[PDB]
Design a binder for this molecule. Structure first.
Ligand code: B4P
Ligand code: B4P
Ligand code: B4P
Ligand code: K
Ligand code: K
Ligand code: K
Lengths: 7, 490, 490, 490, 7, 7, 7
């Protein structure tokens, strides 16, 4: 679940 | 209106239309991610028309580039609007692949179809290529995500214009459209997400037609002050039943009690009145002595006397339709200076002149067959016809609750849509419960429009709480579920 | 009386009034700690009058000094009583801050308001500054803790003297006051803690008005010896119903059975008597042949004969009120030499001379509307008027059960208050259940006052055990919950 | 570079700069929602400069309008750039409130500060108003969200330019900046989210400096084919220890074994060599006969002979620094035609000419104190100086691993940053473990740069897996945790 | 546990 | 958690 | 919960 953000 | 909200947002507030188009596309991507999980494993086929719906599609496709396994756009239109053109140009500069010819087998190499062919700009029937492609997508078994509204759904009526896309997920912008709410469109829409794409909140809120929501119904529920007595919660008279239809009164009466009304009285021809108290001895069921098992003018004075002591009167369930019932219903409603809830056979014999001449308020609760007879049209011309409903409410000074899988509730100025419920309610007895619920909430202090809103919602939600298969739901089980629906609401 | 208990404790037992005042304040602090958890995070605003309630506040404020984030006292009175002065002096010597001017915005910098303005020394309406400050505290959304009674509640009646503080928590001393128990005061009180501040236990116990508690009801519940038969648990006759009100008998009858009575017989006009056994075939429902569907003198002898074999007779639910019912009820009660439970329409036609002349006992179970008609006053003059209730019980030699959100049960010497229940009981049918419960417990050997005490409690507790929203509770569901209430009681 | 990536995205790819600015602001809103939950309860204070960082802030503020409790923008700049101006204009047209004067107490009425004063356009020290406001925000205890980089952090170095904002959350665009990765900036950044705002993925990926990630390290881990023997996994020689430092060899040797090396041999002065096998009898610990407890030229030939049979040699831990060790280390490295890992005291005596003249590869693993001595600068001039590190690697043909809370690993072309680890590694012995890990992975087939990347990561991750307080971590516990770190990596 | 308070 | 979507 | 007692 990572299209917008990388942690 | 929403297309006027786009215009104002661009033209008066000054938001670039390209910005709104970008926000729309990225909302689609986030919505898919929320429904499908990580997108990187999936191959996407984006079907784009030449209008702004297609431009939204180009934004989707460009934002999937280099993040997912494969993207292909099949561009199906002739001209491109300026924003679609801009976004088509971006897609290509980003390395995107576009084709203009659709080969039947192209579906084989993709997992997800993004349907951005037609949105709110659909005019007339879909034919030729557009249609063959929609039919192929529908036969393909892939996951389908529609941008704005599934292509082929009229966004103002929910009607299918010859053919339409059946979506697993539809992402719409600003507000739900009427076509997502009314059938068949509601069915084709699949799961619906409403994205905020940056319209001013003031404008989004000035929309005059609403879906009834849990939050709205929670804030309308009347208060239960601790220091209270039965009179605090009002009194209902239900005038109902006949020798042929002895059950209707009981279901209406318990509908009132289960929503919290203090006192419910039924007026029912003897000896059918005894049926109610044998089932629910909490009810007061007054015997009316009739000539042949039906209400008639001979009962007019007794029923007006019984009305003096109550806050609202419901009339109609199980009365029968013959001329003596017609004389009685119309003379009664003409003299009753109390709010009235008018259902079933009282609708079938109603003279609409009577509604106009009444000082007191009324709620009418027809199904489309009853509404058709009442305004002298076909079922097909009245079903889901919210403008006709609004006109009728406004001309006759009433609230109209037009029952169906989506129920419309209007007083002529404000129109609300209810989407709770299931097919367990498509069974005799279920309307009678609703009529009681409405009368009940009016008795508790809610206005007729508020009473109707809360009731249609809770009546549908109660049905959804049935533990077993919905087709086995009966009106008695529904009565039992009402207090659970109210509890879950808070 | 409790203010006489303070005096005796100081004047005869010799406890320094400063010691009682200290114990009161620290109880408030412990009570807040039990409700709020650790106090050290909170800023406290203590509103102190010039009386001993304010002195209690000064004790609270001083004991929070250096333990919590901030304390400020707003002193609102003119003079100080000696104990308030002493404790004001301590607060200051301890480094405490006091102001005498209240600025509207002062609430912004505090989390908890301790309301020590007026307690039991409230006389007359609150006006001017005191009032503006109470209104501001009520609009402020802070946590409010009232010392003794919320300021503005008359501690003898529960009435609001123009305006009053709405508390989240009230800490009172010695015993609950009548103003915490009757509405509106019960509502304003919020959660109530009763603190022991050192009065001799003998004096606390000599208080003649009590709240009905679970412990009291447990010890009154009759025994169920194993070697028993139906006759061990008594026989009830219920005289009830009419052609208009066919459900009342069933609810009263099952009320008796569900509390453990051995045998219940209903006397009900034919054919409405068949309603009862169709629902609950355990009941005996005797047909009374009547001229027009109502009891009349023609039925007097049959009902006296049916009375010979029973232990108690309940009369009234659903009888109707017309002159023939009046003649019958009064001549019946005049000749019945059995305990009588008199409800509903039997109250509405009752001649009180009849109660005076009866050798046997009676319980009357009116709601305020019925009590108003019976003594010829307004509802507003009888509602929660426990002194009037006591006078009436004493003059007429009966037990009076005056029903409302708080129910008063008195025989003229002993007065009890019931606080179980909820708004689900503000619905027709619910009184009929109670009448049966009472008759039932009398049949089992409880005195009329004991029977009434246990019944009002269990009837309210049953309502609280309903699983769904209380407004959907009906008398039938209530019947089902009675055996659970009894089980939970032990 | 990233600011050149913005330009290209606007100028060559044709994305409107307003679109990128919109995507940036909304990313900030979603990021806050993910960290704070529902935003509607919170009051927001947005501090906006006049540059594009402030424009991002105006977008944030406008998108919170009508959704949250309160928004206020304090605009702190003089001029506005065109995109900031456009977005300031939108905020106002949307009904937004802006002030230009900052009152010290303004923080009292807000829950969240959005810091959009300076981003990557920060030049020189922050002084005057800008500074007083940053100091007030830092003393205020509110939740702080920084747009792009906390204001006052140099985005290329991580240095604080006189004063800087301490954020709970920083949302950055495209890629992490060096200033989020190096301290003090890494500390000020708080929790970091990297948002995709629509740059082409090709450009984002062409960035030549990277953070070492779990995914990268997973794909570099060597394979363990089932049909294998010890020789498959290579052979390490460690040349280490002295009479003063007998522990270093053991920690380096077990570092190699715990990462999966087939065979490890230590060459250690007798009798300190026996220390290793008494602790870990799996190690081979060869006695070197020395004159005074230190390696010297007399041992050169024995150590070159021991080197013939191995794949990599690690040298330095615990050797001591005196002239005879210097002669030996430099003559050894000059003749050893094997990869070398050079640590600790071998760095302190190293002649850098020797590295240039070597055919075989080398990894140097200095801390800043050792790197300072090696290039003859101050600790302050070399610490976190990644450009100096790159120059040194490139000139001397080696991989440089410059150890600190963030470790830099470079070969002159590619530079990587490691952010795993904790203060438990700031303890003697911990570097010796790392040296073994590196030698070990080289022995297994990884290139020197790959070996160094995987090792710094796993060494830090092992430390994070310590179960008790990190300050109690010792190198022996760290050795025990390495196989868990490797397992968790997959 | 009721020496000080009754609920 | 509802800034972007209503269900 | 420590106004009266320390453990
Ligand atoms: N039934 C049909 N068959 C084939 N093509 C059709 C069609 N109906 C519509 N289209 C094409 O698709 C185009 C637009 O599709 P959309 O993408 O839905 O609509 P739009 O661009 O937003 O334009 P709209 O009509 O809403 O009004 P405005 O520009 O002011 O914002 C239509 O204009 C038409 O050319
Ligand atoms: N309505 C009103 N408006 C303004 N002030 C009022 C008021 N009613 C009462 N007060 C003031 O508040 C004072 C006392 O408040 P309290 O604090 O309630 O009462 P008290 O000191 O215990 O005195 P009490 O009257 O109970 O009798 P005794 O001394 O024998 O123990 C009153 O005396 C009066 O001065
Ligand atoms: N230390 C300082 N003290 C006071 N004001 C300062 C300051 N440092 C910077 N500012 C102001 O803040 C402005 C910009 O802040 P930013 O918001 O960080 O930067 P920018 O607009 O993106 O401009 P940038 O300099 O990155 O380059 P380009 O336009 O090509 O994209 C600066 O130009 C300056 O006016
Ligand atoms: K579409
Ligand atoms: K008080
Ligand atoms: K910033």
């Amino acid at each position: 679940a990572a299209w917008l953000f990388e942690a | 209106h929403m297309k006027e909200i786009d215009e104002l947002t661009i033209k008066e507030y000054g938001v670039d239309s390209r910005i709104l188009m970008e926000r729309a596309g990225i909302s689609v991507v986030l919505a898919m991610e929320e429904e499908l999980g990580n997108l990187s494993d999936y191959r996407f086929l984006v079907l784009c028309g030449g209008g702004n719906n297609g431009g939204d599609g180009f934004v989707v496709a460009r934002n999937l580039l280099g993040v997912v396994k494969d993207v292909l756009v099949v561009f199906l239109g002739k001209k491109k609007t300026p924003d679609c053109e801009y976004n088509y140009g971006l897609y290509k500069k980003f390395g995107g692949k576009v084709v203009e010819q659709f080969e039947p087998s192209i579906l084989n190499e993709f997992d997800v179809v993004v349907d951005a062919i037609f949105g709110t700009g659909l005019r007339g029937e879909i034919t030729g290529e557009y249609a063959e492609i929609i039919n192929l997508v529908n036969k393909s078994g892939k996951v389908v995500v529609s941008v704005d509204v599934p292509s082929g759904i009229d966004s103002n009526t929910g009607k299918v214009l010859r053919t339409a896309v059946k979506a697993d997920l539809t992402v719409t912008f600003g507000v739900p459209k009427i076509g997502h709410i009314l059938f068949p469109g509601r069915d084709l829409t699949g799961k619906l997400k409403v994205a905020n794409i940056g319209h001013p909140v003031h404008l989004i809120n000035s929309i005059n037609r609403y879906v009834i929501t849990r939050e709205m119904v929670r804030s309308l529920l009347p208060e239960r002050p601790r220091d209270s007595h039965k009179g605090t919660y009002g009194k209902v008279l239900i005038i109902a039943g006949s020798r042929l239809y002895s059950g209707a009164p009981v279901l209406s009466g318990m509908g009132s009690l289960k929503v919290g009304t203090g006192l419910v009285k039924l007026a029912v021809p003897f000896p059918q009145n005894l049926i109610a108290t044998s089932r629910f001895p909490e009810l007061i069921s007054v015997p009316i002595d009739t000539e042949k098992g039906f209400f008639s003018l001979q009962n007019l004075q007794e029923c007006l006397e019984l009305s003096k002591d109550v806050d609202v009167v419901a009339i109609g369930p199980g009365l029968g339709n013959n001329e003596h019932v017609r004389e009685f219903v119309n003379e009664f409603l003409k003299t009753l200076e109390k709010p009235a809830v008018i259902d079933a056979d009282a609708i079938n014999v109603l003279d609409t002149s009577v509604l106009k001449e009444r000082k007191s308020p009324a709620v009418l609760t027809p199904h489309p067959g009853e509404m058709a007879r009442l305004v002298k049209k076909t079922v097909g011309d009245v079903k889901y016809n919210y403008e006709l409903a609004e006109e009728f409410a406004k001309e006759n000074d009433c609230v109209l609750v037009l029952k169906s899988a989506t129920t419309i509730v209007t007083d002529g100025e404000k129109t609300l849509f209810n989407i709770t419920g299931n097919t367990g309610l498509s069974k005799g007895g279920s309307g009678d419960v609703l009529t009681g619920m409405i009368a009940g909430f009016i008795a508790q202090g809610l206005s007729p429009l508020e009473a109707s809103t809360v009731s249609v919602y809770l009546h549908g939600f109660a049905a959804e709480l049935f533990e077993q298969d919905e087709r086995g739901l009966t009106a008695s089980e529904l009565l039992r579920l009402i207090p659970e629906a109210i509890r879950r609401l808070k």
